[PDB]
Design a binder for this molecule. Structure first.
Ligand SMILES: C[C@H](CS)C(=O)N1CCC[C@H]1C(=O)O
Ligand SMILES: C[C@H](CS)C(=O)N1CCC[C@H]1C(=O)O
Ligand SMILES: [Zn+2]
Ligand SMILES: [Zn+2]
Ligand SMILES: [Zn+2]
Ligand SMILES: [Zn+2]
Lengths: 375, 375
């Protein structure tokens, strides 16, 4: 039906907002929604731009959240059409950010427009929480805006993060949470020496081997109705001097857990240390946690999104926690219920990123359906 | 007693014959031994210098073998006295090559001088096989000279390689053979992907882990009266893109066997392949063999060196095959019996390399003792 969502998505995709630059996407959003009574609050931090746009002063507060930054395109000539000149081809819209996640943003802005026109006196409030750094280190984006909101007791009842969540067809999957991510940087200590005198050296690959095996065979947990089993995966392993006749004196290993609520950050660290210690490994281990798992169990928000998807798309949406993470991990601190909902994530962060054209007005009509069922 | 060995060792150590340069060490040897009837045959190949010096035309042929090249010194200011200005200090002679292996060469040249003076009409022949590349890739040194000798049926009955073999005191250890060295370069194949979708990737660290453990726990053989058990050791392991949220698509591992005659090159390769295949690992594996094990069992030559050491040094020498390897692995093809015998190897290839001064005339008197018992 409407082509306003498509037209706005094109205009957004045409701006090369590679992290953390915004290229005035947030200005364009702010000025457009100002016309139907969204107040704009700019929250810049370091080189990152953020905005909190809000219509209304009372509960329930429904927030759309998302990012105007996009990942680099890589060599442009490898693309079939230029990444920042959105093109319609074979029933798809192609461009960097077409899926992740400018089309969602456009769809939400138009849903707000249609909803407010139909229901000028609706109850509650509608807000957008938009960052120009989700894709980078994200130290100065959403997480800083959330802290500001929380410090002034400006809380959210329902949040929809517009990340692409579909497997294939729009609405087939929504996310009601994500795994936490806990990473370790392990340095196993041995003693370097000539390879032909192994009794005078300590080979850190050999001392690590029995622990490595136990770690990669370990069952961390069962998962549950909402989460898959916690996952351990080694990303990098490096040891040696490059000489083929030397035993190295240390070995570096980097690993990560994507963990469910069935396990805790402290529990996992303890188990790793205990595995390494059981096998007599000598090491340094530095940990870093980029996020705790978060979960909105079945409730009004999940029911509403499901009903909206059933009405617009004709399919039964699956709730999921799989994949990576998003800025929902920050926003959940101030949102009582939060989900993520957007188009297919199949082509994100890749050349020839795209979204099906027929999915664009459908997405907006889903978001408009949600607003109508909550407000 | 005599100080001729010391004086010649100094003169040799003063020439900076870093591989494959000889700095005229071989000329100095050739001209000096020419005076007592050694004929000199220069055998240059590529950038390496070699010489075969020989007195006599009949069996038994006793050969001293060794190298005039030395390893780099590293930053000179870290040395206590300059590496190519031999110094006497605290009862030691210090300099690059003092132990490995110019002092041996000097000691042998003086032993020849004293032996020929005492026994001008001795039977048999005395030869020196000297290279300026043992320490490097050694493609153009001893191995090419041996091929020349073998092609003209010029064989050796008894060979003494002047490598430093002592643990501490001169004569405490002689080598009657060495382990072979068989190296593998393994590339384990997986499939790269985002770490949070492990079921869509293949982690080559994880597929390798059970094989790694089995390899580092494997007992290859028992060893025997002459050899220690065969030894497997990983030298290098590298995999990953540097990103902590990516599963890598491959893993490189470099490993080495120092193997005894109880195992064969082909047998070891087979066992490795079978371990990797039992665990379903997918990989490429390139092998390289830099040497087969070699062994002179107890016989005239070992008995003679032992008796000479007992007479000169007053101790019972141990036969050994431990450590790295030497150019005996080439010369054994043309020498019926071969041993290695020299001073302490404790400080070889290190800063402040040295030899005990009292060991220098003793070494020469050992070599002279050997010549007298064989010729
Ligand atoms: C929310 C992010 C896009 S910014 C996402 O969906 N990712 C990022 C990595 C993989 C993929 C996924 O979770 O499926
Ligand atoms: C024959 C060589 C010196 S060129 C040697 O003894 N090496 C070389 C590496 C270690 C040490 C050893 O075997 O003990
Ligand atoms: Zn993204
Ligand atoms: Zn995104
Ligand atoms: Zn050496
Ligand atoms: Zn040497």
């Amino acid at each position: 039906t409407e082509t306003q969502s498509l037209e706005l998505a094109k205009e957004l995709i045409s701006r090369p907002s590679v992290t953390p630059d915004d290229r005035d996407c947030q200005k364009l959003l702010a000025e457009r929604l100002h016309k139907i009574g969204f107040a704009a609050e700019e929250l810049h931090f370091g080189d990152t731009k953020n905005i909190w746009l809000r219509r209304g002063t009372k509960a329930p507060v429904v927030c759309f959240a998302g990012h105007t930054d996009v990942v680099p395109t890589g060599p442009v000539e490898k693309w079939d059409s230029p990444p920042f000149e959105p093109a319609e081809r074979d029933g798809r819209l192609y461009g960097r950010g077409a899926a992740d996640m400018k089309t969602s943003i456009a769809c939400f802005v138009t849903a707000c427009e249609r909803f407010v026109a139909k229901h000028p006196n609706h109850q509650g409030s509608i807000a957008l929480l938009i960052t120009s750094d989700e894709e980078g280190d994200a130290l100065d984006g959403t997480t800083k805006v959330v802290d500001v909101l929380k410090a002034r007791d400006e809380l959210i009842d329902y949040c929809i993060v517009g990340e692409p969540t579909a497997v294939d067809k729009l609405g087939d999957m929504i996310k009601n949470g994500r795994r936490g991510s806990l990473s370790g940087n392990l340095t196993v200590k041995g003693k370097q020496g000539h390879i032909a005198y192994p009794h005078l050296a300590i080979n850190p690959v050999h001392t690590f081997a029995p622990a490595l095996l136990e770690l990669t065979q370990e069952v961390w947990d069962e998962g549950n109705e909402y989460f898959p089993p916690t996952s351990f995966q080694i990303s990098n392993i490096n040891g040696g001097t490059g000489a083929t006749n030397v035993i190295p004196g240390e070995l570096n290993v980097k690993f990560n857990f994507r963990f469910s609520t069935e396990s805790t950050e402290a529990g996992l660290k303890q188990r790793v240390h205990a595995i390494l210690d059981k096998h007599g490994v000598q090491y340094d281990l530095q940990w870093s946690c980029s996020g705790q798992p978060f979960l909105t169990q079945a409730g009004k928000l999940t029911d509403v999104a499901r009903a909206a998807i059933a009405e617009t798309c004709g399919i039964e949406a699956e709730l999921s926690t799989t994949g990576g993470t998003s800025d929902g991990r920050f926003i959940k601190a101030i949102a009582q219920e939060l989900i993520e909902l957007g188009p297919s994530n199949a082509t994100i962060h890749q050349i020839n990123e795209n979204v099906r054209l027929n999915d664009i007005p459908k997405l907006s009509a889903v978001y408009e359906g949600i607003l109508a069922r909550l407000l």
